[PDB]
Nucleic acid binder design. Structure first.
Ligand SMILES: [Ca+2]
Ligand SMILES: [Ca+2]
Length: 341
DNA sequence: GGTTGGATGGTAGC
DNA sequence: AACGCTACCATCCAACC
């Protein structure tokens, strides 16, 4: 089988530039502002001219303004990027019925009944690149391989505005020689734990006993890496079913005052319910993030489904419970629905 | 032995 | 260290079939 993975480059930053072409060539840093102070928050994503100097998703905004004070710092407009993403995903469906929306900027297309060999895949890849450039003025990277994972690695090597096939013999080679930290799903925490066990390449996961690997990185990532290592991985391309939905917001000031927090929790429940869109949850968890960024969850599963109005009533009960059983001040508050019918 | 449930701890990645 | 946010996984213990 053949798989084609499209990744939209520095996506949030690219859309900001489509909407204001005077950003071409400038360092653009899309940010999530908390409302605490001037410029308090975290970088959601930055374009290649900002990443050049260390300004990446995750780091605090104040770190970034120390590195690039004259960079354009924009607030995040998820609703806008979502719309753009959805219009690009629609173009992608013209090339394949079998598609998987992995995220707001990532999709996999199974193209096994659309092309015979990797030559054609490349050509269709340029046809997807040109098409998205044509309609939305967005560059993307295309990666083609025999499975979802090596198609995503192909895009990673060819990043910005690239395209790259990985044929069967280079899969064999990469199981042997690819830094294992560049395997999708393997962050820096997991890369350091693996490096402590002496696993630097995918093939090294077959020397260590399975239980010693599972005991370190969980059964899920264990089976995943051993599978890629055998060259046996072959998960189908499918609609990702979301298991939970919710919002948590940052409060203006830290607090332990039910009536001061109520409005935020209620605001988060509203937004969560619109995101649910016809899905009926049976479970609610209130998540309070404390003064020191630790987390305090209280929850309930119901015999029956949860209405918006029941969620308000039940979230106050659960929040009251956090205030009784834990006396730290709360900084962020919100809600997490799950167990959909 | 497996599952549902809730609390605590933790992770990848835009 | 600073610091936002969605959603996912992992471990323990309790209660249960
Ligand atoms: Ca991406
Ligand atoms: Ca318990």
């Amino acid at each position: 089988g053949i798989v084609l993975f499209v990744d939209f480059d520095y996506f949030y930053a690219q859309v900001e530039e489509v909407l204001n072409p005077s950003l071409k060539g400038k360092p653009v840093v899309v940010c999530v502002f908390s409302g605490r102070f001037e410029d308090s928050g975290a970088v959601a994503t930055a374009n290649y001219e900002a990443r050049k100097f260390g300004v990446k998703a995750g780091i605090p905004i104040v770190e970034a303004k120390k590195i690039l004070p004259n960079a354009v710092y924009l607030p995040m407009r998820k609703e806008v990027y979502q719309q753009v993403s959805s219009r690009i995903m629609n173009l992608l469906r013209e090339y394949s019925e079998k598609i998987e929306i992995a995220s707001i900027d990532e999709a996999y297309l199974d193209i096994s009944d659309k092309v015979r060999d990797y030559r054609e895949a490349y050509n269709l890849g340029l046809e997807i690149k040109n098409k998205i450039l044509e309609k939305e003025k967005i560059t993307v990277t295309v990666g083609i391989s025999k499975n979802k994972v090596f198609a995503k690695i192909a895009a990673d090597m060819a990043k910005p505005n690239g395209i790259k096939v990985i044929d069967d013999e280079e899969v064999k080679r990469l199981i042997r020689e690819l830094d294992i930290a560049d395997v999708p799903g393997i962050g820096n925490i997991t890369a350091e734990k693996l490096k402590k066990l002496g696993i630097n390449k995918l093939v090294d996961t077959l020397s260590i006993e399975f239980d010693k690997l599972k005991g370190m990185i969980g059964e899920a990532k264990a089976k995943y890496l051993i599978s890629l290592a055998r060259d046996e991985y072959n998960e189908p391309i499918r609609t990702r079913v979301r298991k939970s939905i919710g919002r948590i917001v940052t409060m203006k000031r830290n607090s332990r005052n039910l009536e001061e927090i109520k409005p935020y929790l209620f605001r988060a429940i509203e937004e969560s319910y619109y995101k649910l869109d016809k899905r009926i949850p049976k479970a609610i968890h209130v998540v309070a993030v404390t003064e020191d960024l630790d987390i305090v969850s209280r929850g309930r599963t119901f015999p029956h489904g949860i209405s918006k109005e029941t969620a308000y009533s039940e979230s106050v009960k659960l929040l009251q419970k956090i205030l009784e059983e834990d006396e730290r001040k709360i900084r962020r508050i919100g809600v997490r629905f799950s167990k959909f019918i």
